């Protein structure tokens, strides 16, 4: 039914521009995050931007949760990006709200 319009929307350059802008702001967040001051202070911007980024990435995985994984199981770049989404989503789900038994921090800059 509406799959044609959804694929037309996903072909539009504006959604890709918004995605690229969000992940470039994520790159700048990592650039400011290797510092120590903005790491934990003057960091409300970090919090709201990271919430925006994880919302955008969850939305991207929702676009890639379609029947198109019949092509995201044999291809090249496509399996790489969905597996990257999985190994992104799971750790910060068990890191940002952890409450668990774990040793220490070695995958913040790695996830970014």
């Amino acid at each position: 039914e509406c799959q044609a319009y959804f694929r037309k929307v996903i072909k539009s350059t504006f959604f890709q521009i918004v995605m690229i802008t969000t992940v470039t702001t994520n790159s700048f967040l990592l650039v400011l995050g290797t510092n120590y001051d903005i790491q934990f202070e003057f960091f409300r911007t970090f919090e709201v931007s990271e919430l925006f980024f994880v919302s955008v990435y969850v939305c991207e995985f929702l676009m890639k949760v379609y029947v198109d994984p019949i092509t995201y199981w044999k291809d090249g770049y496509n399996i790489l990006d969905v597996i990257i989404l999985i190994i992104l989503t799971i750790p910060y789900l068990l890191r940002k709200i952890k409450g668990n038994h774990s040793a220490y921090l070695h995958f913040a800059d790695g996830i970014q």
């Binding site: 509406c2 044609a4 319009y5 959804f6 929307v9 120590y36 790491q39 934990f40 960091f43 919090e47 919430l51 994880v54 919302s55 969850v58 939305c59 929702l62 910060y92 789900l93 940002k96 709200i97 220490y104 921090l105």
Partner: protein, 225 residues
């Protein structure tokens, strides 16, 4: 009796000054620091003294840390101190946990904590003897005693502030002198958490519902064309 020439010092091999946080040239002129309402119940503030303390030690959050104390006779290093010693807070904060809680320390006589009342060489009866009428009411009550043959340390909180450790050497077989000191440490953690009851999964579900609402809004866009 006591030997008045003996004293205890804490090593300050590298200190928090002379790097990109604080400088020695400023702290003496009333460099007052903040407490974020975690000691007893409000607007408590702390006043560091550089002359009395010096440059404070620097450790990191979630690092198993133990102070190492040395004995001095006539102003000369002679031997590190290996007896059992305890620490406390003069201000009275609770935002620091302890290591392995006395069961993996093989305690057998219900050790006493900072709740029986100051500790000294007098009040202290250990728990590693075989006293016959208080073995346990204790699954995992902690072991508020460092040093000695055991290997328990202090796990730090995430407050990111200066702490003033008041240290008392507690073994009653080392010397008759009530060895005691005051030293200062400072922690520089990773990140405070202001996530509250909104979880990552809760906000994820909110975003999924909003995106499905957007799709249900864009369905008539294809329907109207």
């Amino acid at each position: 009796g006591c030997d008045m020439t003996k004293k205890i010092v804490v090593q300050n091999k590298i200190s928090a000054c002379t790097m990109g946080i604080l400088n020695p040239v400023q702290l003496q002129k009333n460099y007052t620091y903040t407490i974020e309402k975690e000691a007893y119940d409000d607007d408590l503030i702390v006043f560091y003294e550089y002359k009395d303390l010096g440059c404070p030690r620097l450790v990191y959050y979630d690092k198993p840390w133990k102070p190492v104390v040395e004995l001095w006779k006539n102003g000369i290093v002679e031997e590190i101190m290996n007896a059992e010693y305890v620490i406390s807070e003069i201000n009275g904060l609770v935002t620091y946990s302890y290591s392995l809680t006395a069961a993996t320390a093989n305690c057998r006589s219900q050790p006493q904590n900072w709740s029986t009342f100051l500790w000294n060489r007098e009040n202290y009866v250990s728990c590693h003897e075989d006293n016959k009428d208080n073995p346990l009411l204790w699954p995992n009550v902690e072991y508020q005693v460092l040093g000695g043959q055991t290997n328990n340390k202090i796990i730090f909180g995430q407050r990111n502030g200066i702490y003033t450790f008041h240290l008392s050497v507690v073994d009653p077989y080392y010397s008759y002198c009530n060895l005691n000191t005051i030293f200062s440490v400072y922690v520089h953690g990773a990140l405070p958490v202001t996530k509250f009851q909104p979880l990552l999964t809760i906000l994820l579900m909110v975003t999924t519902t909003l995106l499905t609402a957007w799709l249900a809004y864009a369905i008539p866009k294809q329907l109207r064309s």
